[PDB]
Amino acid sequence: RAKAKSRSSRAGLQFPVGRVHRLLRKGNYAERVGAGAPVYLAAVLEYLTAEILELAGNAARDNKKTRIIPRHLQLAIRNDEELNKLLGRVTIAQGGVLPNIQAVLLPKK
Amino acid sequence: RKESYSVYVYKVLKQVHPDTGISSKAMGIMNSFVNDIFERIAGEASRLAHYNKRSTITSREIQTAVRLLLPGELAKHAVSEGTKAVTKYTSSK
Amino acid sequence: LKSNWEARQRAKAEKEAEKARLAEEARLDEERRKNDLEGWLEEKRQLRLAKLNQLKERERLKADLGNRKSLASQIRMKNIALEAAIRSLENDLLRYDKTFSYDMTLDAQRDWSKSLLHAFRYGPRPFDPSSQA
Amino acid sequence: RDNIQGITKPAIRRLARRGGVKRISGLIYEETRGVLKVFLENVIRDAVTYTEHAKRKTVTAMDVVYALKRQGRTLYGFGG
Amino acid sequence: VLRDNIQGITKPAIRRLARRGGVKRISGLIYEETRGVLKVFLENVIRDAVTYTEHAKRKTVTAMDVVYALKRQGR
Amino acid sequence: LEDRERIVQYPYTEEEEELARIAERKKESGRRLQEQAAKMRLERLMKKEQELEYYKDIQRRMQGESKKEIKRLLDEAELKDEAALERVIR
Amino acid sequence: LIRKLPFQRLVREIAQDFKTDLRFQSSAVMALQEACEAYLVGLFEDTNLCAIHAKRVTIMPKDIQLARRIRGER
Amino acid sequence: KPHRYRPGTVALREIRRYQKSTELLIRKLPFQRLVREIAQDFKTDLRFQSSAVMALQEACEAYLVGLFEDTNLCAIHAKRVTIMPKDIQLARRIRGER
DNA sequence: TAGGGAGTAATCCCCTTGGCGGTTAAAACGCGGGGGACAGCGCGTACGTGCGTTTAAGCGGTGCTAGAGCTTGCTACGACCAATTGAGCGGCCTCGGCACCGGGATTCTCCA
DNA sequence: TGGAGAATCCCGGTGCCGAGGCCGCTCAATTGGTCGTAGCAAGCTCTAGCACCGCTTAAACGCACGTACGCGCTGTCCCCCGCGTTTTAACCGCCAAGGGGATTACTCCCTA
Numbered sequence A: 001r002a003k004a005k006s007r008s009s010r011a012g013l014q015f016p017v018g019r020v021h022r023l024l025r026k027g028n029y030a031e032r033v034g035a036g037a038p039v040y041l042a043a044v045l046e047y048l049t050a051e052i053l054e055l056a057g058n059a060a061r062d063n064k065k066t067r068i069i070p071r072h073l074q075l076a077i078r079n080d081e082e083l084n085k086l087l088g089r090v091t092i093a094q095g096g097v098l099p100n101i102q103a104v105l106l107p108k109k
Numbered sequence B: 001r002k003e004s005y006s007v008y009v010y011k012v013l014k015q016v017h018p019d020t021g022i023s024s025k026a027m028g029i030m031n032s033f034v035n036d037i038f039e040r041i042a043g044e045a046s047r048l049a050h051y052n053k054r055s056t057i058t059s060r061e062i063q064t065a066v067r068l069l070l071p072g073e074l075a076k077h078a079v080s081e082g083t084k085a086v087t088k089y090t091s092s093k
Numbered sequence C: 001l002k003s004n005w006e007a008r009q010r011a012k013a014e015k016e017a018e019k020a021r022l023a024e025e026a027r028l029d030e031e032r033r034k035n036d037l038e039g040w041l042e043e044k045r046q047l048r049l050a051k052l053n054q055l056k057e058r059e060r061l062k063a064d065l066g067n068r069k070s071l072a073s074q075i076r077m078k079n080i081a082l083e084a085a086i087r088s089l090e091n092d093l094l095r096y097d098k099t100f101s102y103d104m105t106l107d108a109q110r111d112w113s114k115s116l117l118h119a120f121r122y123g124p125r126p127f128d129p130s131s132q133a
Numbered sequence D: 001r002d003n004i005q006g007i008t009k010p011a012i013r014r015l016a017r018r019g020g021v022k023r024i025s026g027l028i029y030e031e032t033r034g035v036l037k038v039f040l041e042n043v044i045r046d047a048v049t050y051t052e053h054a055k056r057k058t059v060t061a062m063d064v065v066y067a068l069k070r071q072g073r074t075l076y077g078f079g080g
Numbered sequence E: 001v002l003r004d005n006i007q008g009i010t011k012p013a014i015r016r017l018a019r020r021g022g023v024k025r026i027s028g029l030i031y032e033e034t035r036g037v038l039k040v041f042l043e044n045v046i047r048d049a050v051t052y053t054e055h056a057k058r059k060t061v062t063a064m065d066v067v068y069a070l071k072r073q074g075r
Numbered sequence F: 001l002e003d004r005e006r007i008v009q010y011p012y013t014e015e016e017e018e019l020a021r022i023a024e025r026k027k028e029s030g031r032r033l034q035e036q037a038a039k040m041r042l043e044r045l046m047k048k049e050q051e052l053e054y055y056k057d058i059q060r061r062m063q064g065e066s067k068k069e070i071k072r073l074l075d076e077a078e079l080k081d082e083a084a085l086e087r088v089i090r
Numbered sequence G: 001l002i003r004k005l006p007f008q009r010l011v012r013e014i015a016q017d018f019k020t021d022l023r024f025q026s027s028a029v030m031a032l033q034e035a036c037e038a039y040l041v042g043l044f045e046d047t048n049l050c051a052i053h054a055k056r057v058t059i060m061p062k063d064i065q066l067a068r069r070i071r072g073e074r
Numbered sequence H: 001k002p003h004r005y006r007p008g009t010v011a012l013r014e015i016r017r018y019q020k021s022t023e024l025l026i027r028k029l030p031f032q033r034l035v036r037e038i039a040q041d042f043k044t045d046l047r048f049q050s051s052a053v054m055a056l057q058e059a060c061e062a063y064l065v066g067l068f069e070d071t072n073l074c075a076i077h078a079k080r081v082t083i084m085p086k087d088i089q090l091a092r093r094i095r096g097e098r
Numbered sequence I: 001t002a003g004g005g006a007g008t009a010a011t012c013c014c015c016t017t018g019g020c021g022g023t024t025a026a027a028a029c030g031c032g033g034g035g036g037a038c039a040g041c042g043c044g045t046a047c048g049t050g051c052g053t054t055t056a057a058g059c060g061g062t063g064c065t066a067g068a069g070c071t072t073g074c075t076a077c078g079a080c081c082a083a084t085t086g087a088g089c090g091g092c093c094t095c096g097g098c099a100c101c102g103g104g105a106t107t108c109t110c111c112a
Numbered sequence J: 001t002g003g004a005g006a007a008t009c010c011c012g013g014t015g016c017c018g019a020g021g022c023c024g025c026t027c028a029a030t031t032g033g034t035c036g037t038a039g040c041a042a043g044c045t046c047t048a049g050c051a052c053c054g055c056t057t058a059a060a061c062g063c064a065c066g067t068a069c070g071c072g073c074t075g076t077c078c079c080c081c082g083c084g085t086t087t088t089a090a091c092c093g094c095c096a097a098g099g100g101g102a103t104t105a106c107t108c109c110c111t112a
Helices: A007-011 A017-026 A037-062 A070-078 B006-016 B024-051 B059-069 B072-092 C002-064 C070-080 C083-096 C116-122 D009-018 D028-053 D061-070 E011-020 E029-055 E063-074 F017-064 F069-077 F082-089 G004-015 G026-055 G061-071 H009-018 H028-042 H050-077 H085-094
Strands: none
Touching: A007 A017, A007 A037, A007 B072, A017 A037, A017 B024, A037 A070, A037 B006, A037 B024, A037 B059, A037 B072, A070 B024, B006 B024, B024 B059, B024 E029, B024 E063, B059 B072, B059 E029, C002 C083, C002 F017, C070 D028, D009 D028, D009 H009, D009 H050, D028 D061, D028 H028, D028 H050, D028 H085, D061 H050, E011 E029, E011 G026, E029 E063, E029 G004, E029 G026, E029 G061, E063 G026, F017 F069, F017 F082, F069 F082, G004 G026, G026 G061, G026 H050, G026 H085, G061 H050, G061 H085, H028 H050, H050 H085
């Protein structure tokens, strides 16, 4: 018997192709689940996780914080033209809002 | 036994920002995001299979779900990184 | 082609048997009406009342259905984890129940001739928006 | 009991400040209380059905989250 | 090749659509704005309907492809 | 009420080959819709009668084969029992 | 409301950017037009509310922008 | 004589404070009683997890904060600095919510 | 004939609700004044109505061929399950990030 | 422009507590084999999508022309802000209750 090599390792992914395969089966999404669908999906999950975490890691550094706080995830999402399209109807616990004052409200010169 | 993507989110984190950390409260949002985007792709992949009277979720379902669900440049890079992973998978085993 | 013709013929036999069954039911109702008219009309009145209750329940249901969208999604989790009849009864009562009258019918109960707001706005005449006059 | 009056005028003010609002009509406070109660009723009603169809007496955060996602107002942070 | 066909929703067509919406008076700046609004909507439903058409390996976009694409815009 | 009511007139202004052509289009479109319904029904006739024969053959095999086969054979009709299968049969 | 042939050419023109030589069913064109008519009719109704707000009678592009922004399309 | 800022100065200071912060703006215990008061009319002897009511503050405060933003745009569209109830009514009606 | 399910009540751990007390910070109350809401007014220009022109959309008709839609044949592949182990969860630990405080420095407002 | 004071910054100090890492186990992911099938490849039909032509008219469009409505401008005021005083009740802590649920006890009778 050959030693096991995890399906993630064979795809290079950090995300777990085996669990993603189970969850596609347990969820009854369809009668059958091809061997490649968990690999493709887990790669996309790892990409979208990496996109948001780089922008949130920037926002954390911009605020001198080493840890991503929920604030930094909300800032990263709402400042991004595509994450704000993807998550445009998502509410984030302790995310807050973008600092945004309508210019007509600022004191007149 | 409750299952969380937190260990995999943290491995992605140390690739994009080796110095940077995350709070468990922010990790809960990340875990909520991964579950929500899994559910949205898998749900559209289910509908895509059903619409075509196919019993199998193939990678072609996932690819079309990602092109439906994601906007713009996210869709194109997502489709790229998935096709790469499936190729490296198939070339290995 | 004969097999396709057979399918047409099979339904034609079912159509003929349906028409015969309806005609046989009509023949019985004819003799029930001729002999048991008072009982026969009392059937149609009670049937109309039942059909009215069924329609009112259906009309109430049609008011309950979609009163709040999440009604469906709430109930679905429990699993996971008359018009022609009323008209026909009314028409027979109008034909033969000399105590029945058109003002009883749901048609009259929805006629402009029975509406106060038509009188208020347009008086005893019928109204049409086609007339510029 | 009428605990909707416990949503005080300052609390409604701060929500409007985070909403970027400069001047608030004194008629807003009663209208905002009506808005909040109508919203909060709908979510709790949906949540209680998940609680009862799970045969529970305790409403759980995921009951609320499923009620919110059912309403199109997906909330991240409390669970997947 | 097709070009400039967005002018084919004429100004009176915009009026008919606007009066059906109850609009009484229409700034002339509405016409070019409504054309921009129509095209940005129609591009999204066509893009998804074509994404469904490709999945079936069809060359014909079907009414059911439109229905699925509209149902997705509903989300 | 026509005595109690009084009526004030605001000022107003008021204004066959096409009729045959319209009637032709109405006739043709109506007939074509009836042809579509008849074709759909006649299509349903062959399908549903063969599905009835499909259900009947499932019943025949269910009745013939061992009683342990009953549910698994009627599961070819995606239904647990004839008490269910008779519903869709009817 | 919209005329069929010019809307047809509009949807084919848009399709060129997504896939060349696409075919369209006669029924697929109408399902698009009736959705576009219903979208626009249902939007002017929201611009009119924005024009009857702020006391005007005349809808402005500023009203389309507010109607779309509050519908969430912006 | 003590200082006094002009009308609108501290309103902007307050906007810039609350748009910078993330902490919840409705008081906790007054909201718990509103939730339980609402829940009583659906089912007696219900309980809520603390996380279930805290999840429910976060949802409704985001709903109100998001609504105020839409109503503020309705005010300034009427050329008003002041939001008024008909701004709430317009915003929700455009949203298909009133 | 026997085994294990149905009934029931005592036993005992977990955990959510409610009250008490303080105290303290935020909500409530007052009031001056300001400035923004809003009504009233003038103009002008910009948009709806009408008429003559044109333009091309829509209907009836002919011809073609692509490709949707269906039937047939087979093998590849994912469902399935028994055997094996290591990835990933639950519990425990600690130190360093971050907050919160205090006081001195720079910014911003507003009135002169 | 200046200025005073009030508001916000920043810098250093303190603490605590939660994040990140370590350890046991397990159980759920992986290896290996069997069997059915399902969907992929070929081949036939013929459906309806596309292209073109010619006529009809009714919808579009250019321009005349007014007046109805948009908007700047003035006046008023009232009503919402900003800030000081009064009051209340939100938040925290600690104990209480009981209430629910899973395990254990023991008879009685169904069902294999």
